[PDB]
C-alpha cells in the first residue's frame, strides 16, 4: 500500500487507492501532547511510545487548532501524527510505503537545488519505531519526500511543453510560496518563500476595524466581509451601521493594496515564465493584480483552486 501524505502545519491529509480502484481521502488533526492520557474506560484514548517518550492524541476544539512551525516537520510528534492518521483512516494495519512533504524552502536550498540534508533528515524521522497501548500500529517502510506547493499544479504542468515555464503563485493564510517550474515537472528553475505574507494581513485589518473579539467566530465574520467586499448590501445586512461599513471598507481596501504591492514586488524577482497559475486560499484576492502585472494571455493563466485535497491529490497523480 502506497499512501500519499500532506503532513502540513495544521493537520494531516491522506490519499490512497484501494484494491479495486477507488481513491480515498482522509484528514486527521495535529493535536498531540507529551503525556499519557488517562481513561476510566469511558472514552477512547490513544497512548503512544515512540523513541522513548510517550505521547497521546489530545482532542481539542476544532476552533483552537494550533499552527506548527518548520522544526515540527522533523519532530517525534510529526511521526505520531502521521501514524495516528493511518490508524483512523480506515486502512487496515500493515506495512506501508509513504510520500510526505517538506515546505518549499525546506525542500530546496537558496540555490534552488533540493536540500538533500533536510530531505534525508525528514526520511530518517519516520524510521523511529512506534507502539500503541491496546493495539498494533502500521509499519512505515519506504519514504519519499515531495515539496509542498508544486504538486498542486501538476495537472496543469502535465499539458505544458517541457520547454515551457510555469509560475506557480500560492498565497495562503499566513504564507506566500512562489516557484517557477519547467513543463511536465521536468525541473525547477527558481523557488521563493515568504513566511510573513498572507491573507491574515487583510483579515487582521478587518478584525481590528470592527473591534472583533479574538474568537474564531469573528474570523468567519471577517472572512465573509472580505468575500462579499463588493456587495454593499451584504455588508449593511451584516455590520449594522453605515459608518462602520465605511470604516471597515477602507481599512480592507488599504490592506488589499498593500497585499497586492508586496506580492508583485516578489514576482518582480522572477522572469522567463511562459504560463502563470494562482492558487491558495488567497488566490481570489490577488488574481486580477497578477494578471494585469504579468500581462499573460488567458489561455496561459490558471486558477485551479478546487479543495483542501489539491496538494495530496497532486502528490498522488505524480507517484500513484
From Swiss-Prot:
It holds the Pfam family ParM_N. GO terms for molecular function: identical protein binding. Involved in the control of plasmid partition. Required for the accurate segregation of the plasmid. The keyword Cell membrane does not apply. Homopolymerizes into double helical protofilaments with a longitudinal repeat similar to filamentous actin. Belongs to the plasmid partition ParM family. SUPFAM superfamilies: Actin-like ATPase domain. This is Plasmid segregation protein ParM. One of its GO terms (biological process) is plasmid partitioning. Keywords: Plasmid, Plasmid partition. It comes from the Bacteria.
